[PDB]
C-alpha cells in the first residue's frame, strides 16, 4: 500500500503545511532521516532552516497537512575527511556560534553519530541544551569553529516536573558510540532529547 516497501519515505524529500493554533499555515520542507523502530508512526526529519532534528508522526499529527513525498531520494555525498569524521564521533567538543555583535560564544557539546541519509551531517547535543542538533561539523571544524576535546529503548518514561506532574515519553534510541546516552521523545513535543541516563 501507499508509502510501503520501496516507497518508504525514509531518505526522501518531503514538504507539508504546518499549523499551530489559529496561526497561518506555513510550508515546511525537509529530508526524512529515519523511522523509529519502537514507534513506526514516528519519523525523524531534518527540516531546511531548523537546526534541531524533529520527531513527528507525519501521517497522524493534525498540525501536518497536505503532506507531499517528493520524487527526490537524497543521494549520499562523499565525506571530505573520513578519518576526521570517524574521530569526532563520541567526543566532547567546544562549538563556536557567532551572534548579533559578531561576538562568538563557545558551547560545550558531544558529537553523537553521523546523521543517516544526510551523511555529511552530524548528530550533536549540548550540555546546556540537551536536544538533538544537526550540523555539517567538518565545515565548522575547517573554519576554526569546532575544538575536539581530549534494553531501555522502547520503555515509557516519566519526567518529574516541578509542579508535581509527570511528563510522559518514550526512549527511542541508544547512542551506539556512547551506550549510556539515549534519545527520548516526549509525547507533547517534537524535539528529541538526549540524556546520559544515570542509574538510581
Amino acid at each position: 500500500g501507499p508509502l510501503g516497501s520501496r516507497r518508504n519515505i525514509v531518505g526522501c524529500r518531503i514538504q507539508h503545511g504546518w499549523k499551530e493554533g489559529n496561526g497561518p499555515v506555513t510550508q515546511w520542507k525537509g529530508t526524512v532521516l529515519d523511522q523509529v523502530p519502537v514507534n513506526p508512526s514516528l519519523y525523524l526529519i531534518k527540516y531546511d532552516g531548523f537546526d534541531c532534528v524533529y520527531g513527528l508522526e507525519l501521517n497522524k499529527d493534525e498540525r501536518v497537512s497536505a503532506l507531499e513525498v517528493l520524487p527526490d531520494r537524497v543521494a549520499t555525498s562523499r565525506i571530505s575527511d573520513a578519518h576526521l569524521a570517524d574521530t569526532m564521533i563520541g567526543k566532547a567538543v567546544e562549538h563556536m556560534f557567532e551572534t548579533e555583535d559578531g561576538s562568538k560564544d563557545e558551547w560545550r557539546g558531544m558529537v553523537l553519530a553521523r546523521a543517516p541519509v544526510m551523511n555529511t551531517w552530524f548528530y550533536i547535543t549540548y550540555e546546556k541544551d540537551p536536544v538533538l542538533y544537526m550540523y555539517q561539523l567538518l565545515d565548522d571544524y575547517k573554519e576554526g569553529d569546532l575544538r575536539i576535546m581530549p534494553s531501555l529503548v522502547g520503555k515509557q518514561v516519566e519526567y518529574a516536573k516541578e509542579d508535581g506532574s509527570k511528563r510522559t515519553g518514550m526512549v527511542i534510541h541508544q547512542v551506539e558510540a556512547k551506550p549510556s546516552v539515549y534519545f527520548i521523545k516526549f509525547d507533547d513535543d517534537f524535539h528529541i532529547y538526549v540524556y546520559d541516563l544515570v542509574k538510581t
Binding site: 547535543t125 520503555k155 518514561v157 546520559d196 541516563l197 544515570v198 542509574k199
Partner: peptide
C-alpha cells in the same frame, strides 16, 4: 552528554526521570 537520573519502576514498567 547532559545527565538525568533514571530509576526503573518495575511495578508500572516506567523509567522515572529526575534531575541530578
Amino acid at each position: 552528554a547532559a545527565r538525568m537520573c533514571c530509576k526503573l519502576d518495575p511495578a508500572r514498567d516506567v523509567l522515572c526521570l529526575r534531575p541530578i
